[PDB]
Ligand binder design. Structure first.
Ligand code: A1ELJ
Ligand code: MG
Ligand code: ZN
Length: 287
């Protein structure tokens, strides 16, 4: 309440000041309070506070509830990773122009899922995990004073919960591998149509994984620092790195970001930064 009083009374700087529209956004210089302000700006500039009548104090308490339920002692899967996944979601809807291809409920659920998709993570060394993350997302969404979705009707609320649940479930890389071949086959044949609800639901799953791994697309000095955090989680429980990074980019990332650019050409900076990082890690791999 000492933190919530200061956050609620603050002024929320514009999206341009906060630099949350650039795919190259980084958070290393930001306080926990600054990340909260950037998050309010995301809800605000996506018209989520307005279209769904969110009381300011409730959104402030909800953001702080979400942030508190991430574990700081976890090197990578912490609040900062969830904040970044939401930022890339914002950058994709705005700079990537994905906004027009989605509905308000879908955008409202994507932002909530991106912020929640790793709640109570304990580090890689501890599809059940994603079901636990949605469980914690649901518990916070139902906490007194945190119900940011109270402005929705019951039909709106039930649809949004279904989308939130699927989006968090989609961040299971096993589900991504199960489903990506379909998404690539329909991108191949020039058949991809978002009007198909099964195709729209599949795309929302791919958009989640794209933002979930957005770190692999960051500029080299940032990507180097994030790859450190990843190593500290996998390794030190809190040489071989360059090769494992190129293998991850090859197996997982490059096709995903390639397909995303076909859906919207303005998501190209993700595919670009992911390639420049493959070059950098490949050179390091060769010593
Ligand atoms: C001991 O050190 C490492 C070991 C492996 C990796 C590789 C693979 C790794 C991985 C995973 N998710 C990542 C998400 C983002 C980024 C970035 N940027 C990189 C990610 C990432 N890199 C999950 C799958 N995985 C597995 C199975 O090991 C990196 C480091 Cl440093
Ligand atoms: Mg996860
Ligand atoms: Zn994640």
């Amino acid at each position: 309440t000492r933190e919530l009083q200061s956050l609620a009374a603050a002024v929320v700087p514009s999206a341009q000041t906060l630099k949350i529209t650039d795919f190259s956004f980084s958070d290393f210089e930001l306080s926990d309070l600054e990340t909260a302000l950037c998050t309010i700006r995301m809800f605000t500039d996506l018209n989520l506070v307005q279209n769904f009548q969110m009381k300011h104090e409730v959104l402030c308490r909800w953001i702080l509830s979400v942030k508190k339920n991430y574990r700081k002692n976890v090197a990578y899967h912490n609040w900062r990773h969830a904040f970044n996944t939401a930022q890339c979601m914002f950058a994709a809807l705005k700079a990537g122009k994905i906004q027009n291809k989605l509905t308000d409920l879908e955008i409202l659920a994507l932002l909530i899922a991106a912020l929640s998709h790793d709640l109570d993570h304990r580090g890689v060394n501890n599809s059940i995990m994603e079901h636990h993350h949605f469980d914690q997302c649901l518990m916070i969404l139902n906490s007194p004073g945190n119900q940011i979705l109270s402005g929705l009707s019951i039909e709106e609320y039930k649809t949004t919960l279904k989308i939130i649940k699927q989006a968090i479930l989609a961040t299971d890389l096993a589900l991504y591998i199960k489903r990506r071949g379909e998404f690539f086959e329909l991108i191949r044949k020039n058949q991809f149509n978002l009007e198909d609800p099964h195709q729209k639901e599949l795309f929302l799953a791919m958009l989640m994984t794209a933002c979930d791994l957005s770190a692999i697309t960051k500029p080299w000095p940032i990507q180097q620092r994030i790859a450190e955090l990843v190593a500290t989680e996998f390794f030190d429980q809190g040489n071989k790195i360059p090769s494992m990074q190129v293998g991850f980019i090859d197996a997982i990332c490059l096709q995903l970001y390639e397909a995303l650019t076909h859906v919207s050409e303005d998501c190209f900076p993700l595919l670009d930064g992911c390639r420049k990082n493959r070059q950098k890690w490949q050179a390091l791999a060769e010593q």
